[PDB]
Tab-separated table of C-alpha atoms in Angstrom:
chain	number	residue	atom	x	y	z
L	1	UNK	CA	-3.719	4.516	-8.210
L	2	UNK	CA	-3.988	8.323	-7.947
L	3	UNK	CA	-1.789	11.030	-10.219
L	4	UNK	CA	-0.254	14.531	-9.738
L	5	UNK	CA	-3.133	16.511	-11.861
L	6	UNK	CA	-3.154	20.447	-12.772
L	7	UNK	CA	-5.709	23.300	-12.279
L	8	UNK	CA	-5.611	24.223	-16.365
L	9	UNK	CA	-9.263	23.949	-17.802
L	10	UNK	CA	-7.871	23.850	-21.428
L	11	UNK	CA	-4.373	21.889	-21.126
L	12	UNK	CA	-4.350	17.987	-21.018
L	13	UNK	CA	-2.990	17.756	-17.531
L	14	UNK	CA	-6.027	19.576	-15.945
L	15	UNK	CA	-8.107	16.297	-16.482
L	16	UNK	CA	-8.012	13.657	-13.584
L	17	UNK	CA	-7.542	10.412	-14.234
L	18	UNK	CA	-10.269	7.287	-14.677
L	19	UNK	CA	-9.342	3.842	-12.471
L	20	UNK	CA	-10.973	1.005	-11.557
L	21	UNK	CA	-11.154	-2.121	-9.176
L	22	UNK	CA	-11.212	-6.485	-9.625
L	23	UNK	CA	-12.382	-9.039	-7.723
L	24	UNK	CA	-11.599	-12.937	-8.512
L	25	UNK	CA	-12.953	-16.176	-6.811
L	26	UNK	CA	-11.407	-19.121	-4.967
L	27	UNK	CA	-13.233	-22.589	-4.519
L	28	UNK	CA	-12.875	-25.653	-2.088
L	29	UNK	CA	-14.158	-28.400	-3.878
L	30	UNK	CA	-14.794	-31.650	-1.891
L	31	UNK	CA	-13.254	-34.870	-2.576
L	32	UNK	CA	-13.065	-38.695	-1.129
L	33	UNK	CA	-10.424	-40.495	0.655
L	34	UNK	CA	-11.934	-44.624	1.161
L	35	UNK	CA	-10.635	-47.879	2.147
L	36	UNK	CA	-12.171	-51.102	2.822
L	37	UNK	CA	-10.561	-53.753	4.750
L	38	UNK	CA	-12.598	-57.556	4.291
L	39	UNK	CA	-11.318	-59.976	6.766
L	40	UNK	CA	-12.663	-63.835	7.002
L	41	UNK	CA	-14.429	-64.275	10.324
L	42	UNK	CA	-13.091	-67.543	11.332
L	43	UNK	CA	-9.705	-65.245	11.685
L	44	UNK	CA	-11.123	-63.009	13.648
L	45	UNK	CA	-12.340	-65.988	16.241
L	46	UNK	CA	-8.997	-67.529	16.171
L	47	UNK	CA	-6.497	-64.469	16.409
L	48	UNK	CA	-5.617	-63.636	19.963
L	49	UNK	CA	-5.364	-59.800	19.533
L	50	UNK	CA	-9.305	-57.770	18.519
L	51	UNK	CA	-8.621	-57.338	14.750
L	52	UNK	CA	-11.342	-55.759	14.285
L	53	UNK	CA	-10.222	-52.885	16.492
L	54	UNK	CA	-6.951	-53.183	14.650
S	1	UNK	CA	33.474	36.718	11.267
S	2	UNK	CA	35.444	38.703	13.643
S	3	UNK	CA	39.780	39.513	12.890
S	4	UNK	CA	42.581	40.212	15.003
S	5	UNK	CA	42.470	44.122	15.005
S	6	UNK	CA	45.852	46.268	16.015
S	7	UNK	CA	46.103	49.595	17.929
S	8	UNK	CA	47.376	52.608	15.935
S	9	UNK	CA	45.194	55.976	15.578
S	10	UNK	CA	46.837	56.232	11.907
S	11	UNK	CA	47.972	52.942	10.546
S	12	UNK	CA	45.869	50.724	8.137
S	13	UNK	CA	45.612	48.000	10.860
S	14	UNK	CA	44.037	49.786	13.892
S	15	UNK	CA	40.636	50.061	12.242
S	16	UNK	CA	37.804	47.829	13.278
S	17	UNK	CA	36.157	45.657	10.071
S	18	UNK	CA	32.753	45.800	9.005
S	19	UNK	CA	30.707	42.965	8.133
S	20	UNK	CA	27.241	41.555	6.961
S	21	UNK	CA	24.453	38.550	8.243
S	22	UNK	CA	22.025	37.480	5.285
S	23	UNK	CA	19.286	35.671	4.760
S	24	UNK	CA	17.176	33.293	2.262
S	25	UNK	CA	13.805	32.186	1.579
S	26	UNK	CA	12.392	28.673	1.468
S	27	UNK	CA	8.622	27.238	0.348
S	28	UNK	CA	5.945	25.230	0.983
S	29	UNK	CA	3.628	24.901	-3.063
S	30	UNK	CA	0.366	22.839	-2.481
S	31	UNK	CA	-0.215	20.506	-5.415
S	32	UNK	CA	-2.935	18.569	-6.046
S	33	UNK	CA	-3.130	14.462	-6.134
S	34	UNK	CA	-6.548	12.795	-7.643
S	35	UNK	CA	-8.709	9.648	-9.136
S	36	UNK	CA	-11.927	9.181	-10.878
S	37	UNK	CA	-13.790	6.006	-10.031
S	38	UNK	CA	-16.669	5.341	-12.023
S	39	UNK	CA	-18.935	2.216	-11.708
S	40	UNK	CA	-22.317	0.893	-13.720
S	41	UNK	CA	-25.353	1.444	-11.431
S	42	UNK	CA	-27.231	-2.269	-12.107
S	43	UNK	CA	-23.371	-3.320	-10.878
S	44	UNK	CA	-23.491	-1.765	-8.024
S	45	UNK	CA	-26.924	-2.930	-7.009
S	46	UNK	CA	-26.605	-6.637	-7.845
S	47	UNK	CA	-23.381	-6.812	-6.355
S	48	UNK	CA	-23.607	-8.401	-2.526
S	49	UNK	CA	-20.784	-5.460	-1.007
S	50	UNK	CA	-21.017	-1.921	-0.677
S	51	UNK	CA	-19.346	-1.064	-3.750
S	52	UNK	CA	-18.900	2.570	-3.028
S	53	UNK	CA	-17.821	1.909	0.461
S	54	UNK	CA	-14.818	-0.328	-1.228
């Protein structure tokens, strides 16, 4: 931020101010999501519906 | 502001009344607004932005 600041070379008002800027960080971080689905295969010859595309 | 004036050439009322406009003064007084910014010189090399642009 700025301030108001005087013209006097003696007075403590004729000083301008010192300011400065900050940066921070942000972070994706992967992660898993699994499943496994085991299924006998004399089901899958016997069912009428494709359980495997189920 | 003008008055109802009356019409004798002796009597208080037939006289016509003076009167007055005036005027005032207003102004503009420049003032000054500022900031220092001062930053390390290795900083503002290693960094990957133009610092002094920001």
């Amino acid at each position: 931020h700025a301030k108001w600041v005087g013209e006097s070379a003696t007075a403590p008002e004729g000083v301008k101010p010192t300011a400065k800027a900050t940066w921070a960080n942000k972070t994706l971080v992967a992660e898993e999501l699994a499943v496994i689905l085991p299924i006998h295969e004399n089901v899958l010859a016997d069912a009428t519906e494709d359980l495997l595309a189920e």
